[PDB]
RNA sequence: GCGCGACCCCAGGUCAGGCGGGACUACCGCUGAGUUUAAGCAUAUAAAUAAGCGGAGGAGAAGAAACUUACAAGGAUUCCCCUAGUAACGGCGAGCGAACCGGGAGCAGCCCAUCGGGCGGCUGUGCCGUCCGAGAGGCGUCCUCAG
RNA sequence: GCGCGAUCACGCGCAUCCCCGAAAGGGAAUCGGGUUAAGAUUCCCGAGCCGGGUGUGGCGGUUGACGGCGACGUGAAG
């Protein structure tokens, strides 16, 4: 076997899981308005994953 | 293994679905009237050729010297030009459906005393009526000096 | 007039003399035909000429089949689940006559063509058959033509099905006027029932 | 030459057995459209980790990351074009970058090495 | 030149030979920024957004000219699955464009039909 | 007792040219419920609603009388106002429920029943060169006359 | 018709179609050693083989193969 293969959901995962990662210092900083708590950040243990 | 090998129409059919029953509705029935008889065809081969020479007799200059011919084909201007009363002679085809547009033409024809041919083809009346298409009806309305072989 | 009118005044009487004969023999055709037939022939020239005929490219006529009877309403062997003024199952018959039904199917399987107007070519014993003109919108002899340019317009698109052909306004109700055409002019959902 | 005559006993003469005829084609004048220059640039950029460079030493081998409309055969003409070095296999992965690593293994006779230092890489 | 380049006007006035050259020199020098990336520098921050720029400004100003090119050489002939795109754009453009209007009133019953006038005594 | 080339019906392909299939919020066209009400309920009512389905346009849709009519006149068609909770329907229970007209909103009457295609030429919504397929009637002074 | 020859370009033959449907039905070919913080029968080092696809020569043979009672062993379209 592979480790379920198919490219198609295999990226997409990959790209959600780039996608959670932290807000860059920066934004906080120029910057309008927010305890910028970014918030669709999404974690091992909880909630569960989508598509 | 060897020997025949022929005949597809009569034993291996499908093959045409549409056609079959039509050769069974010119032959079978059951039926009330309507149309029938007569060509030899010698007699209709005259006729188209004093069809041809009747709209190939054609000059008619700029002067009312003699315009000379005219041959009309189409089933309307054929029953016009009768009740119009100036066809010289009408013919028919046999070979038409809808039967419809020409059962008309012999009833009216006979209360016209204008006489008229039933060639068998449609074809051969559209071309010798020099048409580019077949004509299910026409008209001589003036021949052009045949009056002798006309009567 | 012409020739046009002794092939009307045969198809008034359907059941007498040549014209039972030829077109119940047309019907060994018909049976044979599909639910399609597209045809280069008017099998009616009168009344071709009389709901819109001019032979010129973009027009066609087709033959449709539709059934006989009335319709017969889902679902049977689990019925309705409701009050007896209510329940209903070939008891009602459509309120589209059968012209429409048919006209619906042809502008379904021609879909870059829009019906003109439609007439009746018979019935056997569960078939009633129907001749309709649809004409095309998107071809130059169409448009240029002032008798037929009409139907290009983009508001004239799929016409029939918002019964806009003249079966469309006769089942609609609007072959009256006056008095008591009062509930069909100029919609059946006109007043919104204020 | 074939004529007809021969078709219709050739109709008669087979109980089933199919049809046949064979058939040219042709392009009109109205003149289809279209002038194109689509390109993408598989080489994105000589991607740079500490196992890379050990990749380098050890086998002879550079470390690119490219596209994802890449496979190996654009990219084993890629690498030949625009560093001028013919490589012998190509190894390709979906990464959880989004985008494809690409370790590639070079002939002996132009190594990765010297290869790569116009270029720097670690 | 050797410093970093580009105005609109500029490419405008090069041939189509010279521009190519100019799109060759950029992807490589574009080449060099990827590497340069390593290194992070500042100058490779600037210089990587507005080569980006020069590329696009490239591109472009290709397609137009070559656009351009077609319809000059094809408006002496016949032509255009693709100007005609740019005509319609497209299917209710398409039912706008027939065209219906001037048309539809051109035939049949039509000379006179409105009040006259002013005309008639102009020509006296 | 027969084969062939050609006309004419059907069918498949083919590339061309042309259109259509999905979408936007409601508006805008068939099929078609029940809670409910009638203090129950079965006709009736809720409701031709909602919903389902299809399809259009910037608006649709409806239109120049086989009309109204109850007289003696009007004069295509929507809509607004009211005619009216009248007429008519209905356990004639509960409820249902208008039209003619009348005055406005705005007005308009018409129309059936040589065409296109291909190149070439242009100042390409066009026309020319060409090749191809396919309210009517007679007479009369005249008044009016396209662009 | 599709399918195949066929080189010069062209014609010939037939019956039930065409994709998805098992990463555990069926199936062309790989192991051993090494190395990485993290891969590994996947890269390397050694060695092997397969599949698919053009040339080359050894020759085994030539009016399409000898031997061994035999069994059996050591061209090419329709």
């Given at each position: 076997m592979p480790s379920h293969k198919t490219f198609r959901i295999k990226q997409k995962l990959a790209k959600k899981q780039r996608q959670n990662r932290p807000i860059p210092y920066w934004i906080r900083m120029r910057t309008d308005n927010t305890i910028r708590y970014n918030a669709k950040r999404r974690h091992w243990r909880r909630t569960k994953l989508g598509f | 293994?060897?020997?025949?090998?022929?005949?597809?129409?009569?034993?291996?059919?499908?093959?045409?679905?549409?056609?079959?029953?039509?050769?069974?509705?010119?032959?079978?029935?059951?039926?009330?009237?309507?149309?029938?008889?007569?060509?030899?065809?010698?007699?209709?081969?005259?006729?188209?050729?004093?069809?041809?020479?009747?709209?190939?007799?054609?000059?008619?200059?700029?002067?009312?010297?003699?315009?000379?011919?005219?041959?009309?084909?189409?089933?309307?201007?054929?029953?016009?030009?009768?009740?119009?009363?100036k066809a010289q002679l009408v013919v028919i085809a046999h070979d038409v459906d809808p039967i419809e547009l020409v059962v008309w033409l012999p009833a009216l024809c006979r209360k016209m005393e204008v006489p008229y041919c039933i060639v068998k083809g449609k074809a051969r009346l559209g071309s010798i009526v020099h048409k580019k298409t077949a004509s299910v009806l026409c008209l001589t309305t003036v021949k052009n000096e045949d009056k002798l072989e006309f009567s | 007039m012409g020739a046009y009118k002794y092939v009307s005044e045969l198809w008034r009487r359907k059941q007498s003399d040549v014209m039972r004969f030829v077109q119940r023999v047309r019907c060994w055709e018909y049976r044979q035909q599909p639910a399609i037939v597209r045809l280069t022939r008017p099998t009616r020239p009168d009344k071709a000429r009389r709901l819109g005929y001019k032979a010129k490219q973009?027009?066609?006529?087709?033959?449709?089949?539709?059934?006989?009877?009335?319709?017969?309403?889902?679902?049977?062997?689990?019925?309705?689940?409701?009050?007896?003024?209510?329940?209903?199952?070939?008891?009602?018959?459509?309120?589209?006559?059968?012209?429409?039904?048919?006209?619906?199917?042809?502008?379904?399987?021609?879909?870059?063509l829009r019906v003109l107007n439609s007439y009746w070519v018979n019935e056997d014993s569960t078939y009633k058959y129907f001749e309709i003109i649809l004409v095309d919108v998107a071809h130059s002899a169409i448009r240029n033509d002032p008798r037929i340019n009409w139907l290009?317009?983009?508001?004239?698109?799929?016409?029939?099905?918002?019964?806009?052909?003249?079966?469309?306004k006769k089942y609609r109700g609007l072959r009256g006027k006056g008095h008591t055409h009062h509930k069909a002019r100029p919609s059946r959902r006109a007043t919104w029932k204020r | 030459r074939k004529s007809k005559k021969i078709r219709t006993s050739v109709t008669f003469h087979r109980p089933k057995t199919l049809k046949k005829a064979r058939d040219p084609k042709y392009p009109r004048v109205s003149a289809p459209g279209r002038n194109k220059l689509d390109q993408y640039q598989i080489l994105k950029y000589p991607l740079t980790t500490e196992s890379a460079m050990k990749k380098i030493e050890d086998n002879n081998t550079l470390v690119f990351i490219v596209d994802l409309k890449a496979d190996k055969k654009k990219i084993k003409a890629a690498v030949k074009k625009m560093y001028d070095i013919q490589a012998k296999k190509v190894n390709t992965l979906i990464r959880p970058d989004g985008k494809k690593k690409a370790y590639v293994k070079l002939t002996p006779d132009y190594d990765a090495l010297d290869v790569a230092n116009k270029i720097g890489i670690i | 030149m050797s410093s970093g380049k580009v105005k609109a006007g500029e490419l405008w006035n090069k041939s189509k030979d010279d521009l190519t050259k100019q799109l060759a020199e950029l992807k490589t020098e574009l080449g060099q920024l990827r590497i340069q990336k390593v290194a992070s520098s500042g100058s490779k921050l600037n210089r990587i957004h507005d080569i980006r720029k020069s590329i696009a400004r490239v591109?472009?100003?290709?397609?137009?000219?070559?656009?351009?090119?077609?319809?000059?050489?094809?408006?002496?002939?016949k032509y255009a699955p693709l100007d005609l795109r740019a005509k319609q754009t497209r299917a209710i453009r398409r039912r706008l464009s027939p065209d219906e209007k001037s048309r539809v009133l051109e035939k049949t019953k039509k000379r006179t039909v409105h009040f006259p006038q002013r005309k008639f005594a102009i020509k006296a």
């Amino acid at each position: 076997m592979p480790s379920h293969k198919t490219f198609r959901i295999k990226q997409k995962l990959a790209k959600k899981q780039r996608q959670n990662r932290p807000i860059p210092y920066w934004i906080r900083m120029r910057t309008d308005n927010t305890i910028r708590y970014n918030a669709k950040r999404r974690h091992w243990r909880r909630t569960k994953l989508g598509f | 293994r060897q020997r025949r090998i022929l005949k597809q129409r009569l034993k291996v059919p499908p093959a045409l679905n549409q056609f079959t029953r039509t050769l069974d509705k010119n032959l079978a029935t059951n039926l009330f009237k309507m149309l029938l008889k007569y060509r030899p065809e010698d007699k209709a081969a005259k006729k188209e050729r004093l069809l041809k020479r009747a709209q190939a007799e054609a000059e008619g200059k700029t002067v009312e010297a003699k315009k000379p011919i005219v041959v009309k084909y189409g089933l309307n201007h054929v029953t016009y030009l009768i009740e119009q009363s100036k066809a010289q002679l009408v013919v028919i085809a046999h070979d038409v459906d809808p039967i419809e547009l020409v059962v008309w033409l012999p009833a009216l024809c006979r209360k016209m005393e204008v006489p008229y041919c039933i060639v068998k083809g449609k074809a051969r009346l559209g071309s010798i009526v020099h048409k580019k298409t077949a004509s299910v009806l026409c008209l001589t309305t003036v021949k052009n000096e045949d009056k002798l072989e006309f009567s | 007039m012409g020739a046009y009118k002794y092939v009307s005044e045969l198809w008034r009487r359907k059941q007498s003399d040549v014209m039972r004969f030829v077109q119940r023999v047309r019907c060994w055709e018909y049976r044979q035909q599909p639910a399609i037939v597209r045809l280069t022939r008017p099998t009616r020239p009168d009344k071709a000429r009389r709901l819109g005929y001019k032979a010129k490219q973009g027009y066609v006529v087709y033959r449709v089949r539709v059934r006989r009877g009335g319709r017969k309403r889902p679902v049977p062997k689990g019925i309705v689940y409701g009050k007896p003024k209510h329940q209903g199952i070939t008891q009602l018959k459509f309120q589209r006559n059968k012209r429409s039904v048919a006209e619906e199917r042809a502008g379904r399987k021609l879909g870059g063509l829009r019906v003109l107007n439609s007439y009746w070519v018979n019935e056997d014993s569960t078939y009633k058959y129907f001749e309709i003109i649809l004409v095309d919108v998107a071809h130059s002899a169409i448009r240029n033509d002032p008798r037929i340019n009409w139907l290009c317009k983009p508001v004239h698109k799929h016409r029939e099905l918002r019964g806009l052909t003249s079966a469309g306004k006769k089942y609609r109700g609007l072959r009256g006027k006056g008095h008591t055409h009062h509930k069909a002019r100029p919609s059946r959902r006109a007043t919104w029932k204020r | 030459r074939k004529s007809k005559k021969i078709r219709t006993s050739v109709t008669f003469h087979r109980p089933k057995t199919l049809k046949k005829a064979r058939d040219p084609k042709y392009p009109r004048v109205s003149a289809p459209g279209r002038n194109k220059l689509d390109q993408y640039q598989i080489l994105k950029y000589p991607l740079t980790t500490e196992s890379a460079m050990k990749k380098i030493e050890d086998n002879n081998t550079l470390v690119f990351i490219v596209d994802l409309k890449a496979d190996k055969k654009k990219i084993k003409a890629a690498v030949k074009k625009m560093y001028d070095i013919q490589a012998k296999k190509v190894n390709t992965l979906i990464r959880p970058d989004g985008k494809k690593k690409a370790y590639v293994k070079l002939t002996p006779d132009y190594d990765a090495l010297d290869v790569a230092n116009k270029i720097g890489i670690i | 030149m050797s410093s970093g380049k580009v105005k609109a006007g500029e490419l405008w006035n090069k041939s189509k030979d010279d521009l190519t050259k100019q799109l060759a020199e950029l992807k490589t020098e574009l080449g060099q920024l990827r590497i340069q990336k390593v290194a992070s520098s500042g100058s490779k921050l600037n210089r990587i957004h507005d080569i980006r720029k020069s590329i696009a400004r490239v591109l472009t100003v290709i397609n137009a000219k070559q656009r351009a090119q077609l319809r000059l050489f094809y408006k002496n002939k016949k032509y255009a699955p693709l100007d005609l795109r740019a005509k319609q754009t497209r299917a209710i453009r398409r039912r706008l464009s027939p065209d219906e209007k001037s048309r539809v009133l051109e035939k049949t019953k039509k000379r006179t039909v409105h009040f006259p006038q002013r005309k008639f005594a102009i020509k006296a």
